[PDB]
């Protein structure tokens, strides 16, 4: 969707054309006297950038703004000025570095801007960058958007193309990321991906405890992830259509390999997951048999089923475009108020 | 002595020579010394038994109620004595101490029965 990717409006709409060196000196002396500064200066700077060294200067000035007396304002239109200024001049190393150390820079793109970024990633045909970026979106917890289908495509493709058997950080990242795209409750793909994510989270718990499940990952503390997977399977068997894939075999493998032979966060009366493994496996076999007694093709490759989504993806992209023009109109409406605001100070002087 | 902040407190003042303590419940500020000045002398207490075997203590009910209505905090020994008296609720730490003493005495009797 080259039309969905490109947009001449942003590049040909409301350019400032001020002196980059003058703006740099102004911002430098203002941050040396460490008084607060409006986002208007950074916005005009970014709109005026036309060079790689200038984007680097802007990166350092954005770091300074993060460490400036004001940090919360976090104007999305300025964030997207920066994002375009970086991605059109092709600094993916810089984009990825900022996006991974968001705490150092604090960039937070919305649905359409992020979908543009990830579509550029598709066009350049890279996987590791997109994978790290979707992990950072898992950190964001922003999935109730038209980019949900793009996130789903990405994860469904990369979890299959990974071919990496042992990695605890990466595996926890995958297990926690496979949930949020599926909360839209759309189809077999959705709730079975939620099932597989529950399975991965329970595996991560049983192999390295519940601490990392929540410490540096926003998750729920209920240890029964296998229990929740069993609940999901039983309610699905009770209830539509369930197009299935052989990742249930991966679930079987994990369960069997865990059944194979300090601070105490677990509650005393409630049993331990180590002691629950046996009945977990018994009920898992039971639900397996019930599902096969009840859909059970396990042939349709899930990454291929994301091509079915491309059509209604091509329908919801229109809604996304419309919301983006609404955002642009709101920005152009409320931003001019801030230009007269500086005129207020200048006329007062 | 104008004490900043602070608050009035009915507490025990000590009298009598060594090995003869005589406590006096009396209202005063939180910052006053032990034997420091006071406002009104409220009551007395002798931790020693008399010729009858009992020991002595006096309470000024109406005045103490007036002081509490005016607002003054209580020290743990004096409110413990009040709770033991009955004008005041009984003390939970007193209940725990009693129960611990009874447990220890039961254990001692058990050990004596074992030895015998």
């Amino acid at each position: 969707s080259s039309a969905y990717v490109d947009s001449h409006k942003w590049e040909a709409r409301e350019k400032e054309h001020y002196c980059l060196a003058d703006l740099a000196s102004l911002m430098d002396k203002t941050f040396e006297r460490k008084l607060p500064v409006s986002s208007l200066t950074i916005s005009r700077l970014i709109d005026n950038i036309s060079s790689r060294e200038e984007i680097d200067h802007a990166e350092y000035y954005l770091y300074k703004f993060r460490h400036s007396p004001n940090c919360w304002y976090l104007r999305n239109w300025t964030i997207h000025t920066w994002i375009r200024q970086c991605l059109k001049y092709d600094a993916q190393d810089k984009a990825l570095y900022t996006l991974v150390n968001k705490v150092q820079y604090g960039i937070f793109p919305d649905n359409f801007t992020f979908n543009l970024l990830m579509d550029s990633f598709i066009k350049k045909e890279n996987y590791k960058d997109a994978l790290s970026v979707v992990f950072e979106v898992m950190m964001q917890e922003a999935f109730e958007v038209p980019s949900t289908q793009l996130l789903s495509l990405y994860v469904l493709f990369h979890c299959l193309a990974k071919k990496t058997d042992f990695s605890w950080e990466e595996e926890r990242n995958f297990g926690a990321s496979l949930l949020l795209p599926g909360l839209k409750q759309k189809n077999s793909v959705g709730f079975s991906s939620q099932l597989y994510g529950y399975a991965l989270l329970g595996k991560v718990e049983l192999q390295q405890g519940l601490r990392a499940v929540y410490h540096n990952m926003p998750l729920i503390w209920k240890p029964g992830y296998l229990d929740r997977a069993l609940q999901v399977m039983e309610k699905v068997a009770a209830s539509p259509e369930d197009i299935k894939l052989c990742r249930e075999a991966l679930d079987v493998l994990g369960a069997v390999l865990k059944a194979l032979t300090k601070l105490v966060e677990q509650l005393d009366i409630e049993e331990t997951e180590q002691s629950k493994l046996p009945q977990y496996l018994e009920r898992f076999k039971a639900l397996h048999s019930k599902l096969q007694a009840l859909k059970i093709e396990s042939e349709g490759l899930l990454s291929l089923t994301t091509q079915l989504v491309k059509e209604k993806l091509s329908t919801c992209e229109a809604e996304d475009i419309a919301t983006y023009e609404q955002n642009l109109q709101q920005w152009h409406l409320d931003l001019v108020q801030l230009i007269q605001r500086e005129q207020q100070q200048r006329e007062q002087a | 002595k104008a004490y900043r902040g602070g608050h009035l407190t009915i507490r025990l003042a000590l009298g009598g020579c060594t090995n003869r303590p005589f406590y006096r419940i009396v209202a005063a500020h939180n910052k006053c010394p032990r034997d420091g000045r006071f406002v009104e002398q409220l009551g007395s207490y002798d931790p020693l038994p008399n010729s009858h075997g009992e020991k002595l203590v006096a309470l000024n009910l109406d005045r103490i109620r007036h002081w509490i209505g005016c607002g003054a905090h209580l020290s743990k020994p004096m409110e413990k004595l009040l709770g033991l008296a009955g004008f005041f609720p009984l003390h939970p730490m007193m209940i725990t101490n009693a129960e611990r003493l009874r447990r220890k005495r039961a254990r001692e009797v058990l050990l004596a029965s074992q030895k015998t």
Partner: protein
């Protein structure tokens, strides 16, 4: 009477200097995890919080990983939810991090709160922000998490005194005297306090 001016001068100058160059909140909240001693103070931490300071992170460090520090996003009082099975949270309204912090991991933020599902139409300062006892709840499992549904005799001496009083008055009043206890809202320890009431070095 002889006046004195250098005393006023010293008072004013000390007040101005301290309110100008007081130590930063992040500076005095920083903790070294291997020794468990705050800089600028040289004080040790309590044994009950040693492990939590070693393991768990701070509120602003948790809020730095999402946009706008998560307005309306669920952070729950780990202590409240370990002390009681009922859900307790914070309707965080306003946030302000400290610019001097490197990771922007310190600041001040508050809004409305709730204790065992008893929400108040009241947005007040939080209590104990700097602790390493903060737990972030996602946006999923949100509604399920947030879902939520006489008298005592007087003392014996006091009741005897009132009996004697009303007998001297003359009325029988065979009813046993009582007081209201449903009115007395005995509040648990963990009910929060007013940050501004407590000072700062």
């Amino acid at each position: 009477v002889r006046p004195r001016l250098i005393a006023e001068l010293a008072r004013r100058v000390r007040a101005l200097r301290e309110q100008l160059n007081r130590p930063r909140d992040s500076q005095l909240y920083a903790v070294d995890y291997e020794t468990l001693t705050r800089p600028f103070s040289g004080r040790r931490l309590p044994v009950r919080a040693w492990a939590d300071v070693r393991r768990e992170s701070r509120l602003l460090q948790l809020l730095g990983r999402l946009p706008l520090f998560g307005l309306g996003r669920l952070v729950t009082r780990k202590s409240w939810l370990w002390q009681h099975d009922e859900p307790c949270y914070w309707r965080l309204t306003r946030v302000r991090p400290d610019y001097t912090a490197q990771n922007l991991d310190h600041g001040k933020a508050w809004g409305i709160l709730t204790f065992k599902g008893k929400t108040e139409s009241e947005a007040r300062e939080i209590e104990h922000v700097m602790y390493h006892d903060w737990r972030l709840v996602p946006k999923h499992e949100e509604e399920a998490f947030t879902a939520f549904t006489a008298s005592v005799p007087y003392p014996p001496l006091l009741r005897a005194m009132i009996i004697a009083e009303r007998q001297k008055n003359g009325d029988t009043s065979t009813e046993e005297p009582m007081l209201n206890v449903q009115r007395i809202r005995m509040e648990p320890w963990d009910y929060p306090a007013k940050q501004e009431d407590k000072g700062r070095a």
